Design a protein around this ligand. Structure first.
Ligand SMILES: [Cu+2]
Ligand SMILES: [Cu+2]
Ligand SMILES: [Cu+2]
Ligand SMILES: [Cu+2]
Ligand SMILES: [Cu+2]
Ligand SMILES: [Cu+2]
Lengths: 471, 467
């Protein structure tokens, strides 16, 4: 009785409404847009076609468009160098392409158009998270090998600001370089080359020869990561935006700190400390016209993914490995981030091992729930946690597949759309979950190693639940 | 109401779709029972800087979900430049690789580069032999084909085909006929290797596009031997064994080879109104000739029905039809004779270009791609393969390519490919109603697709008997 009828897929797609999913491919080298209303891939682009020999397509953010089906724009970046070598692909390449490109891409209703390489224009080759600003007219990119971030103006493709962050360990032994504390220095960079250009193209500036992979923060302390400035790494990750404006939070994985910046004067203002049992924050002291310091007696655990709720009144930071939890601050005081204080921590008995790590997130538009990926190394199924974002309690956990990454949400709040990525070698897919029932409604095929995904927004209100406020 | 996808996938049964990505540079396997992509591989990761992943064939596996093997090839050179992508690359990678890939239940493994091992870089169709123990690759820029042994990764035979035009004027080089010479190649390098890697041997700088015979005649295809090309396409197999058919697009001929003694035995002539066949004359120990007083039309898609009793060749460009031969006499291909032609008022000229097909296992119907340049909708034709009549045409999307079938005969699975820049997808059609049941997303420019077979009987409706 199991094969009594032919079934058409139309009702499945019809439920989602008119939303376009954008995904980067990591080791596939592609970017693609999928129409969730029809199942068609609207367009794709392959970086190698354009002469990028190492197009590790990493992160992306899309800007609001009045009609995504007629056109939209996004930024997607790449890694480079020896990052080709760290996912177990048995390549014999000797000298990988330099990479670290930042591409502006426009969909025109038919195809993608590679508009510009902002890395080549600006001299900032930055390979980790890309976030749109809340107004949709700028974007930030961070890098965790170079420990640089910058905010860019979209219209002019210009650098608004760039900062370097450095670690000076108390204990010079690699094993203890973070555990026993140190000083974090934050320096506002100035361009050094003609045309206001920075000197950070390609692999230039890397302190370590490849990224700290998902769940691999501690690989550095273990001697598993080569580089010239191993004990000076903080592993910057993202600059996420307060949807109320003015503030952004820079995540630094190895110290487990989120540094709050004033975007209106480009200065750091306070450092939030992730670890459970540690203070809410540490002060930032100005030590020169362009230089600030944070002093830490210890680092309890690394942290990684970070985000504001849609109303900006909560900030989340995911502690990992030494602790696996969701740390929550009360950010309701928009006037003064030095008053932001820890208010809750989400924990679970099942999170007590090294893995799972609390990972990428997305909030419902109404702020009632937050969905959080649960990452594990092979072979444990990865999943999605459903958290009550008013009382800060775990509601449900669901298994999905290997190597779960990002979550997006349709802007009416009805469906979460996520990606899993096979460690660049095994099963991959797009997963869709109904937010009313918290049930998976289906998996779609995906040729991708995606560490990101976005739904193309129509308005700045949509950005509150896109790649702007959270990773 | 929410709707779950389970019932949509549950209707298919346990089949794995394998696809190359063309300009994406990938290959991937999708589980049609769950929607998951089981594995993928990106050729650029391995240092192939122009991985135009082109054609493929998979071998029978007792349990595809536990493991399977396939061959996928690539094109290179100026094939990068024919799809309107505004690349600034000046010197494309040479390409023309032939990769053996194994799925191990978890991942793909790049086992070998047979082009490097053998010295034969061949970039057009890949076909499995009927016994699943060998495969052929043809190339229409070099006009070489070879059949390979899978176990030993060795060349069983290789041939070069050349055209000597009667009229040396490019516009008349095929219309006014010529002599086709077939030469059995011998390796020329140490260790029994051929000297045809990368772009070496190309007569033209890219594979002719659909309708591209006209562009070649009009002087719009670059290359060093433009009037000596025949545009070999595929070596397709008689499912009964013994014979293979080598399609040559420009002369519109299918050359039948004896796979036992490796000699050409007869040349089938596509064009309506022309003879069923022409003789092949041996002129030296390694050389044969076919003489044509004229070429009435090019042809492209070629292949056998599952029982081996019909052979099809699709005329295009100057005629647009499906020519059918009675090949019921397995003993003597010189007796294969034209028996039917499928025509339609809507089939004239170059477009639609009917350049892929798949039969139902029972042989009752054949599904044929209907390809057009942008912006005309592309689709699928359904042909009655007993009475030889067109039944139906269904519009799908832009840039339609290959058609596979589930081996229970229930669903056709095809791919469309956006001209490497717009909409792409996997399309599934119910063979009872001849209706599309759905489209799945696909980051791919695929010009091939296969369903991984379990048995040699499955190969009769896979990338073996047709392309
Ligand atoms: Cu991150
Ligand atoms: Cu990543
Ligand atoms: Cu991720
Ligand atoms: Cu063909
Ligand atoms: Cu095709
Ligand atoms: Cu092709």
């Amino acid at each position: 009785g199991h094969m009594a009828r032919t079934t058409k897929i139309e009702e499945f797609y019809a439920q989602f409404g008119k939303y376009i999913l954008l995904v980067p491919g990591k080791f596939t080298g592609t970017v693609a847009a999928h129409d969730l209303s029809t199942g068609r891939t609207l367009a794709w682009l392959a970086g190698w076609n354009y002469g990028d020999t190492n197009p590790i397509m990493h992160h992306m953010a899309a800007f609001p468009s009045p009609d995504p089906y007629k056109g939209f724009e996004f930024i997607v970046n790449t890694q480079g160098g020896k990052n080709l070598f760290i996912y177990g692909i048995p390549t014999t390449v000797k000298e990988p392409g330099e990479g670290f490109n930042i591409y502006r891409v426009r969909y025109d209703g038919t195809k993608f158009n590679l508009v510009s390489n902002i890395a080549e224009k600006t001299g900032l080759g930055l390979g980790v998270h890309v976030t749109a600003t809340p107004d949709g007219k700028g974007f930030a990119v961070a890098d965790g090998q170079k420990d640089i971030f910058a905010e860019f103006d979209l219209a002019t493709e210009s650098v608004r600001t760039a900062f370097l962050v450095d670690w000076k360990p108390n204990n010079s032994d690699l094993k203890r370089a973070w555990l026993e504390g140190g000083t974090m220095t934050i320096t506002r960079l100035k361009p050094t080359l003609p045309g206001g250009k920075y000197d950070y193209t390609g692999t230039k500036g890397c302190k370590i020869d490849w990224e700290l992979v998902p769940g691999g923060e501690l690989f550095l302390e273990e001697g598993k990561v080569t580089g010239t400035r191993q004990t000076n790494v903080v592993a910057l990750d993202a600059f996420v935006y307060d949807p109320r404006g003015r503030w952004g939070a820079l995540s630094a994985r190895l110290p487990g700190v989120a540094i709050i910046f004033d975007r209106q004067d480009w200065e750091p203002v306070v450092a939030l400390v992730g670890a459970k049992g540690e203070p809410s924050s540490l002060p930032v002291k100005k030590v020169a016209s362009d230089t600030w310091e944070i002093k830490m007696d210890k680092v309890v655990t690394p942290a990684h993914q970070a985000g504001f709720s849609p109303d900006g009144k909560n900030f989340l930071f995911m502690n990992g490995v030494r602790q696996n939890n969701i740390m929550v601050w009360d950010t309701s005081n928009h006037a003064d981030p030095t008053k932001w204080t820890k208010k809750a921590v989400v924990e679970d008995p099942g999170w007590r091992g090294s893995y799972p790590n609390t990972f990428h997130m997305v909030f419902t538009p109404d702020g009632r729930k937050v969905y959080v990926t649960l990452w594990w190394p092979s072979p444990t199924p990865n999943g999605i946690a459903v958290v009550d974002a008013r009382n800060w309690k775990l509601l449900k956990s669901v298994d999905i597949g290997p190597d779960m990454h990002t979550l997006a949400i349709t802007y009416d709040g009805k469906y979460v759309v996520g990606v899993f990525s096979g460690y660049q070698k095994t099963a991959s897919g797009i997963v869709i979950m109904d937010t009313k029932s918290d049930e998976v409604v289906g998996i779609l095929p995906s040729v991708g190693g995606h560490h990101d995904c976005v739904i193309v927004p129509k308005t700045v209100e949509d950005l509150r639940c896109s790649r702007c406020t959270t990773t």
